Design a protein around this ligand. Structure first.
Ligand SMILES: [Ca+2]
Ligand SMILES: [Ca+2]
Ligand SMILES: [Ca+2]
Ligand SMILES: [Ca+2]
Ligand SMILES: [Ca+2]
Ligand SMILES: [Ca+2]
Lengths: 12, 5, 173, 173, 11
């Protein structure tokens, strides 16, 4: 969840 | 995070 | 606002003490990069993370408070996009010939001599730089530029520092 | 002559290029600490080794030549001797209360602000410092003190550095 | 075996 949020900040 | 010259 | 959300997210990442330690940063960064296997990396080592934290730890608390983490993550966010932009052959790494461009894209303008040492310190045998080295390098390069600028003022462009300060700036990084 | 003997030993450690790379240093080191359980450690990370190399790489070849390796190794074995001396409770690590003594022994006189930052950057969650962190920390401290001196006329106590020099000094470390 | 040499040099 917290990681999901961060990961989505990564392009592609 | 910027410049050199 | 979008910020209030990150603040909310930071709270999940910070844990009880409300700051992100080197260990937390490592697991967080590794949990993120693993979800993007297109970013070739052996993972962020604990050592690299203590160094990233220390270099970002302006208020010397040993960990990263909200603002520091946000600054760090905004940078990683932006540099991560540049990393993809310059991994033109989709090898998962930044080739040596693509590196100057990537750095420039991050707003960094150095020279053949700096890039050579950068490569030497951050690239593999083939002149390639993987994701953690790329990110850790830029975190450091950004922090070092800010350190200089802050120690300067508005002109000179040539700071002076004693032994106390030199060890501070170099040992705690 | 020990140097001749060490020279013959070094040759077996360097290889093709006659110098010890970060990867080669890491392996030599970890294979050595392994043979010494009493020395608590999770091994020397590749980034830590890259950092030690850069810092030791005075002639900027990217790897450690004989003289640089000999210097580094003479320091490690001696600092390693000090390490065991200060691991009073045979914990395999150095206590935070024992750390200031271990450092003084190594010949380093820093304190108050400085020291706290060191602990903060290399100590564990309880203030204890393990082998790779202890060694790496001293290798860097030694390198920095020395790097400072080499930039002083008659030790006016201060060094003036421009941007290129600063980035060179801090990025290649 | 160059390791043992080094392994012996430090206590
Ligand atoms: Ca925390
Ligand atoms: Ca902090
Ligand atoms: Ca590529
Ligand atoms: Ca070699
Ligand atoms: Ca060298
Ligand atoms: Ca102890």
């Amino acid at each position: 969840d917290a990681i999901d949020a961060l990961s989505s900040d990564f392009t592609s | 995070a910027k410049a050199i010259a | 606002e979008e910020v209030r959300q990150f603040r909310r997210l930071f709270a999940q990442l910070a844990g009880d003490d409300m700051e992100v330690s080197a260990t937390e940063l490592m697991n967080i960064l590794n949990k993120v990069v693993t979800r993007h296997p297109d970013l070739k990396t052996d993972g962020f080592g604990i050592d690299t993370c203590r160094s990233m934290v220390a270099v970002m730890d302006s208020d010397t608390t040993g960990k990263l408070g909200f603002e520091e983490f946000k600054y760090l993550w905004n940078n990683i966010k932006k540099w991560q996009a540049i990393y993809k932009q310059f991994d033109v052959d989709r090898s998962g790494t930044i080739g040596s010939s693509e590196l100057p461009g990537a750095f420039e894209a991050a707003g960094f303008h150095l020279n053949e001599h700096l890039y050579s040492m950068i490569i030497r310190r951050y690239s593999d045998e083939g002149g390639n730089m993987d994701f953690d080295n790329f990110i850790s390098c830029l975190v450091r390069l950004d922090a070092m530029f800010r350190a200089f600028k802050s120690l300067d003022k508005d002109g000179t462009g040539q700071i002076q520092v004693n032994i106390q300060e030199w060890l501070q700036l170099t040992m705690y990084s």
